[PDB]
Ligand binder design. Structure first.
Ligand code: NAG
Ligand code: NAG
Ligand code: NAG
Ligand code: NAG
Ligand code: NAG
Ligand code: NAG
Ligand code: NAG
Ligand code: NAG
Ligand code: NAG
Ligand code: NAG
Ligand code: NAG
Lengths: 166, 426, 197
């Protein structure tokens, strides 16, 4: 099998050659020709998440790795992994593409995929005094919309034609 | 045999009424899961363990390596929308004023604390401490990983600080439209007015209601800790996910009709035409185990979404306004609600008006004077034994029967049980 | 805008397309064509190769039904909410915040939609607010006068009483202010004069 072979700090008694884990998988082994104890750990793996503004604006894409510390693959290391392809700007805006851990990416201004921390909105301190009430003077009638589904398309399968076709 | 409670016998007469003379402000708690733990599996690691030939036979099967990931991805987005539809019911992030004197109430355990470097209230400190090769690394080496949430605990903390800086300084005017400032002593007088009680009870007992409120928040800090299982419904959703992920790594060592459960041993003892026969027993079986996990996660997400939608309703009808739904915003006449962040959930601190110290009186539907009936406009006609007074319905307040709280509609020959008295006129 | 009405269509399309593509995938068999198995084989072995496809298709058809049961519960939940929002918002004025549109609910108009419904919530959103000086009660002759329906406001010099959701000043009178107790317990009471008609 594949995996990294490194020395182990275990205390293998001199009657135990192999070694398993809580998933019954070989996590250690004894080399016969040297009588030692190696720590069989699986070779580096992870995930790939491509960030794309869409094939309507540009073809630039950011590659987001999952589970890497930018040392096992503009480079940025977030709590989700190494984001290679986007730069981390300071000024925060609204979220456009969720990356994770409070970081989103948008294709703003030159045009490159920038990265920023999520902004939960503007700050509006309400002046609270012991005698100060705000009474509105005008009204603004507004009409909103809520799109609630009601039903789905009905279906019916043939259990004698799908399995056996003619 | 389990008892269903004490056996109380409420007396019922024709001319008996029980009007309470005091009140007891009680602050209860309500725990609701609003989120879960986003997971992501890998087809070429769970099914095939570090094998290259197995990856070839896995492609020969159907599409059970992209509809499971797409199904788990839909759950992940769903677990990121629940936290975005409940803690984000306000566009602006309101802040508390520097001077903290809200009439006499002590909002020191629900408001964020600047000392600790986490921006969490004292009540939101024991909630994150009780709800908590290692197992987190063992599951990762089998293809089962965990995705970090979009909104961190820091962003949810300041999200619960904007719904708590407008409920105290604006009341319910920051969820409908523009946040309108209003003194808190005048905010508890319009919330005491939507439960039948008038506003002349708060302004005459402000120091008493302020002491009961402060004495009710200090007990929540102890109640949650002293209780053996208080944050248990927030741990059941964690234990269920810490069990399905552990019941899935234990099926990689159970052969389903092959010589062993290690894929690296079926190809080292068997040539390549009996192998294909015994590998489809360790692939089809593992595909159904991974499919059963996704199937149960979809039913699991259906229970979290119901609680998440319920939390969004209890943070827009208990926090963004006083509700008149019994048992919905606590247990009693609802007055206020303070959202408290929690791991994969939220804690509602409902303030309920609970009457106490009730005393019996003598009631009457209408009174008769000058040959015409007089019905109570807003209140009840009680009697202390010799004189008749008009009092409220949720609180006792003896007032003389004047021609400013009674309307004359009918005569004294149609109402059954009409007493005679003298309706004073100013 | 009609994104949550296309999601149920895309999910059903994806479900009806992930089920047909599996009719060309060898579930451990020699081929996906049933005619090829029955022809280029012998009866005893053919009943083994046709058994790996008849089983890998029953699991796919069962997977479709299981997914259609979990998804119908999501549709039933949205249908019970739509029925509730067509009785509390359309068949009357609800007093539940955020339930019938954002803001103070006035009325709603239902409109049909493909595999769904669209509500038009008419809400009351205040605007153009100001700043005034308030007071719990007002002492005139010894007793406190509390607002019967409204809030006491002041324009710096005089004192008036306005509504809680719309500014409309009226002179303080004995018809909109009730008396309760003396001016000794209320904290923040001011001194003014109430009118008597
Ligand atoms: C052969 O194996 C024995 C046992 O591990 C070891 O002690 C010895 O040094 C080995 N010799 C060689 C040639 O590696
Ligand atoms: C990455 O390595 C640095 C080394 O200084 C460490 O501080 C950091 O916590 C590591 N991050 C992860 C994701 O392990
Ligand atoms: C309200 O009065 C209290 C006590 O005098 C004072 O501490 C507080 O700052 C006042 N608040 C304002 C801003 O009027
Ligand atoms: C209220 O707002 C509307 C719309 O902006 C405007 O036409 C009207 O003049 C305003 N009325 C007042 C009282 O200012
Ligand atoms: C009310 O009056 C009726 C008729 O006199 C009587 O039958 C009934 O018991 C009374 N109820 C009580 C318990 O006061
Ligand atoms: C009401 O209850 C509180 C708390 O027990 C008490 O301090 C107060 O004296 C009571 N008042 C009346 C009206 O008995
Ligand atoms: C609020 O409660 C805390 C904890 O008991 C206390 O330290 C603080 O002094 C109180 N503040 C006021 C103004 O009562
Ligand atoms: C009933 O109330 C009146 C007026 O307060 C009082 O004069 C009378 O003594 C009271 N009687 C009893 C029995 O409480
Ligand atoms: C009220 O007065 C009328 C007329 O005198 C009398 O017929 C009736 O019985 C009286 N009712 C009571 C409750 O005393
Ligand atoms: C307050 O309102 C009264 C009546 O409209 C007016 O006479 C007075 O000048 C106003 N004062 C100020 C400062 O607005
Ligand atoms: C208000 O009236 C009270 C009671 O008569 C008096 O003690 C006080 O001086 C008055 N204050 C003002 C501002 O007129």
């Amino acid at each position: 099998g594949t995996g990294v072979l490194t020395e182990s700090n275990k205390k293998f008694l001199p009657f135990q050659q192999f070694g398993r884990d809580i998933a019954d998988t070989t996590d250690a082994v004894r080399d016969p020709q040297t009588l030692e104890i190696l720590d069989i750990t699986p070779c580096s793996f992870g995930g790939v998440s491509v960030i794309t503004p869409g094939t309507n604006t540009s073809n630039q894409v950011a590659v987001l790795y999952q589970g890497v510390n930018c040392t096992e693959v503009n480079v940025f290391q977030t709590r989700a992994g190494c984001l290679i392809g986007a730069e981390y700007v300071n000024n925060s805006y609204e979220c456009d593409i969720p990356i994770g851990a409070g970081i989103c990416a948008s294709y703003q201004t030159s045009q490159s995929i920038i990265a920023y921390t999520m902004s939960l909105g503007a700050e509006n301190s309400v002046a609270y005094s012991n005698n100060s009430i705000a009474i509105p003077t005008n009204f603004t009638i507004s009409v909103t919309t809520e799109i609630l589904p009601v039903s789905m398309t009905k279906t019916s399968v043939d259990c004698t034609m799908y399995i056996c076709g003619d | 045999t389990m008892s269903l409670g004490a056996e109380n016998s409420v007396a019922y007469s024709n001319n008996s009424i029980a009007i309470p003379t005091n009140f007891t402000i009680s602050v209860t708690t309500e725990i609701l899961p609003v989120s879960m733990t986003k997971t992501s599996v890998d087809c070429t690691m769970y099914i095939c363990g570090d094998s290259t030939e197995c990856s070839n036979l896995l492609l020969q099967y159907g599409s059970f390596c992209t509809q499971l990931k797409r199904a788990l991805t839909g759950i992940a987005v769903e677990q990121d929308k629940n936290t975005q539809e409940v803690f984000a019911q306000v566009k602006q992030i309101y802040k508390t004023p520097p001077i903290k004197y809200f009439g006499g109430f002590n909002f020191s355990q629900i408001l964020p604390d600047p000392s600790k470097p986490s921006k969490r209230s004292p009540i939101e400190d024991l909630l994150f401490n009780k709800v908590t090769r290692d197992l987190i690394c063992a599951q990762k080496f089998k293809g089962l990983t965990v995705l970090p949430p979009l909104l961190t605990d820091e962003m949810i903390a300041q999200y619960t600080s904007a719904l708590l800086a407008g409920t105290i300084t604006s009341g319910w005017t920051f969820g409908a439209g523009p946040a309108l400032q209003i003194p808190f002593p005048m905010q508890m007088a319009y919330r005491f007015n939507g439960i039948g009680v008038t506003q002349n009870v708060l302004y005459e007992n402000q120091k008493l209601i302020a002491n009961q409120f402060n004495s009710a928040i200090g007990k929540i800090q102890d109640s949650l800790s002293s209780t053996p299982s208080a944050l248990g419904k927030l741990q059941d959703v964690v234990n269920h996910n810490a069990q399905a992920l552990n019941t899935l790594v234990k099926q990689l060592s159970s052969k389903f009709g092959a010589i062993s459960s290690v894929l690296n041993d079926i190809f080292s003892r068997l040539d390549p035409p009996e192998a294909e026969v015994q590998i489809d027993r360790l692939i089809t079986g593992r595909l159904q185990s991974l499919q059963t996990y996704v199937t149960q996660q979809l039913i699991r997400a259906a229970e979290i979404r119901a609680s998440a939608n319920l939390a969004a309703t209890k943070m827009s009808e208990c926090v963004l306004g006083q509700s008149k739904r019994v048992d919905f915003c606590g247990k009693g006449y609802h007055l206020m609600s303070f959202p408290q962040s929690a791991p994969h959930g939220v804690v509602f601190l409902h303030v309920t008006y609970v009457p106490a110290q009730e005393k019996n009186f003598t009631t009457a539907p209408a009174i008769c004077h000058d040959g015409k009936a007089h019905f109570p406009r807003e209140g009840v006609f009680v009697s202390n034994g010799t004189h008749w007074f008009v009092t409220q319905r949720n609180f006792y307040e003896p007032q003389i029967i004047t021609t400013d709280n009674t309307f004359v509609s009918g005569n004294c020959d149609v109402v059954i049980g009409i007493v005679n008295n003298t309706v004073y006129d100013p």
